[PDB]
Design a protein around this ligand. Structure first.
Ligand SMILES: NC(=O)c1ccc[n+]([C@@H]2O[C@H](COP(=O)([O-])OP(=O)(O)OC[C@H]3O[C@@H](n4cnc5c(N)ncnc54)[C@H](O)[C@@H]3O)[C@@H](O)[C@H]2O)c1
Ligand SMILES: NC(=O)c1ccc[n+]([C@@H]2O[C@H](COP(=O)([O-])OP(=O)(O)OC[C@H]3O[C@@H](n4cnc5c(N)ncnc54)[C@H](O)[C@@H]3O)[C@@H](O)[C@H]2O)c1
Ligand SMILES: O=c1ccn([C@@H]2O[C@H](COP(=O)(O)OP(=O)(O)O)[C@@H](O)[C@H]2O)c(=O)[nH]1
Ligand SMILES: O=c1ccn([C@@H]2O[C@H](COP(=O)(O)OP(=O)(O)O)[C@@H](O)[C@H]2O)c(=O)[nH]1
Lengths: 338, 338
């Protein structure tokens, strides 16, 4: 199929695009490069075995979206573009609602004008919020997300659900990713954000290669076993495989198809730090810090729905995620060329 | 004050602008004329006793909004612009989320650029959604809104609330209007949408002057006394006064200020029809149609908060609302000229 991958030079997107190209799909990447490096493109192409088209631009530019969709006869859209830092969103709400809500609205408006009716949305475990039972299950209601990032993702889910009710030929996947970590097994593609990483694992990896002095751990007084936050860590390669399976299986199947994509087990921040220390051979330096706004104490997935319906499940462990990120970072301590 | 009134040529806006101008404010009206007529402008000037400035344009045009804000040295913004039909929103969700959510986002992004920090938002009783506690009280939670229109308004409430947490010098009023009806007592300004009215009272009035054959009452099997929907009808002049009071009292008061603006009693569709037949002297032709998607059976306000805090409450009765609408419509059967 001919796939538009917004945010496709980013972390999840770059891994997804490799898998898409390996499966014979045609890939067009749209990215504004605010949180990724252009030089990942040829790495995607070498690992994927096929050339992806690149367009530098912004999902908020509806005119450009419409041009792309038409110029390439796109079949399906995988949407990764947006801003993703929970704590940052509390400080910069308008930027998150603009990139995430308006940006998705602009993209789906261009899709409706171009008659493209297959959408795979990068949602988040943060749409559940504080109320729902853990592990999270898709058949029980969401609650109140705890940050503008989380709220933005739930607002887009709702907008997309109401679009599909009005326009019932659409197929829309709401894929609630949990916490992807890890890197491609070659060690030549991994996470490389712009500036200081907001996510846990790339920060730890940059400490381990000597770029940053110490990890700050955001909270040690949570109601968790060791007092640090607990999350469901999923290897980015398993995540990317799930996304591709969803895209293929759900294209042209009308409805709103909701899946948790996670490993189904929780690990704490200190668990991740310990996993990485064993992979790299040295204790990763850290210090405790206050809780980050927008963080819940603990959550993890029930990913049985994706197992039953998509025949997908995780295959890699947290230790293997830490090993693959260390393999990447140690090979490329400054990330991609710039 | 120097007041920007988006949507100011519209129903509630035009009445509000007349009250603003009578209080000596400088008023700039911004409207795209999708649901109002430009020929209302001299009426607003005459009844207001003072000339407002008019700009034809769209709240989604951020650059234009910023220009108006700077040029006119705006102190506070009253935001009426948007789309407002519950049933239409179910059919046309994208247009609702764009005009309502992106439109408000573009406006408040302009205000951040121009350092304007006083906002009065037209919210709606539809944000309460399926909250079973009725009359609705501000200090009790919102439920799930039951249409894209209602969800759009609550999404904007949430965005504004997050903005004010990040930028705590903002003063933001979330004014949850109930169901405004009626017309200026002169009989020369009233409700005149483009096309076929979506709201109950302007449809009634256009049947009463012979422009429409029969009112469609949407549902006759609700769990109410007569089976028709129940709402809290508030005279538009009372609502205009309340908006003006809120603007004047809440300017430069940092915080998020939530008020229901309603009469605090419920009346059914048939109650309104009977009040109109009494006012016009002829029984209004009607029939029953199916329930309209998005509609709840019954709701009305607790408007005690506005009484205690803003010293505002309703003064006009349902019969006066119907008499004033008939006065307008019988004087001006075709509304304002095109
Ligand atoms: N990483 C996670 O833990 C995680 C968890 C749940 C959901 N998600 C979601 O998955 C998606 C991808 O996350 P990621 O980890 O790959 O992040 P990322 O930052 O690596 O990828 C996002 C990409 O989008 C680009 N981008 C951002 N705003 C854009 C805009 N307006 N127009 C065009 N390009 C823009 C960035 O330059 C970047 O390449 C995001 O929607 C994110 O919210 C991520
Ligand atoms: N009438 C009600 O029962 C009611 C109840 C609760 C809340 N509200 C809210 O109050 C506000 C005003 O309601 P109203 O009854 O006066 O409706 P209205 O349609 O008469 O007024 C809205 C005005 O906004 C203009 N407009 C619409 N979209 C615009 C855009 N993108 N940019 C610029 N102008 C635009 C229209 O042309 C119109 O003049 C709306 O936000 C509405 O949702 C109305
Ligand atoms: O530098 C960091 C980044 C993250 N975290 C914690 O690590 C976990 C994962 O955070 P991340 O930002 O990667 O993803 P999130 O869970 O917000 O999606 C959460 O408990 C964060 O509080 C941390 O302690 N230090
Ligand atoms: O042509 C119409 C318009 C509205 N209504 C009913 O009148 C009440 C008020 O509807 P309106 O659309 O004016 O405002 P809403 O209550 O949706 O804000 C509701 O019970 C509607 O179902 C109706 O029966 N016929």
């Amino acid at each position: 199929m001919r796939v538009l991958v917004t945010g496709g030079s980013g972390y999840i997107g770059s891994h997804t695009c490799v898998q898409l190209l390996q499966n014979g799909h045609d890939v067009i990447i749209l990215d504004n490069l605010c949180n990724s490096k252009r030089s990942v493109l040829p790495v995607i192409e070498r690992l994927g075995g096929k050339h992806p088209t690149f367009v530098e631009g912004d999902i908020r530019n509806e005119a450009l979206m419409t041009e792309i969709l038409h110029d390439h006869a796109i079949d399906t859209v995988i949407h990764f573009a947006g801003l993703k830092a929970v704590g940052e969103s509390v400080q910069k709400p308008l930027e998150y609602y603009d990139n995430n809500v308006n940006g998705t609205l602009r993209l789906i408006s261009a899709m409706r004008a171009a008659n493209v009716k297959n959408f795979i949305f990068s949602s988040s475990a943060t749409v559940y919020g504080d109320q729902p039972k853990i592990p999270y299950v898709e058949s029980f209601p969401t609650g109140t997300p705890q940050s503008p990032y989380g709220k933005s993702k739930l607002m887009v889910e709702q907008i997309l659900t109401d679009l599909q009710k009005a326009q019932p030929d659409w197929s829309i996947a709401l894929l609630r990713y949990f916490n992807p970590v890890g890197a491609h097994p070659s060690g030549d593609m991994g996470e490389d954000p712009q500036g200081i990483p907001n996510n846990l694992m790339p920060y730890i990896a940059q400490v381990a290669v000597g770029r940053r002095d110490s990890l700050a751990i955001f909270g040690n007084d949570y109601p968790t076993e060791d007092g640090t936050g607990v999350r469901d860590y999923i290897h980015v390669m398993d995540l990317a495989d799930g996304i591709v399976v969803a895209m293929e299986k759900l294209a042209n199947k009308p409805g709103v198809h909701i899946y948790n994509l996670g490993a189904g087990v929780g690990n704490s921040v200190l668990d991740v730090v310990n996993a990485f220390s064993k992979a790299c051979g040295k204790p990763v330096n850290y210090h405790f810090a206050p809780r980050r706004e927008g963080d819940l104490p603990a959550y993890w997935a029930d990913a049985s729905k994706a197992d039953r319906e998509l025949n997908w499940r995780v295959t890699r462990t947290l230790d293997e995620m830490a090993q693959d990120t260390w393999h990447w970072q140690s090979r490329h301590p400054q990330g991609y060329p710039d």
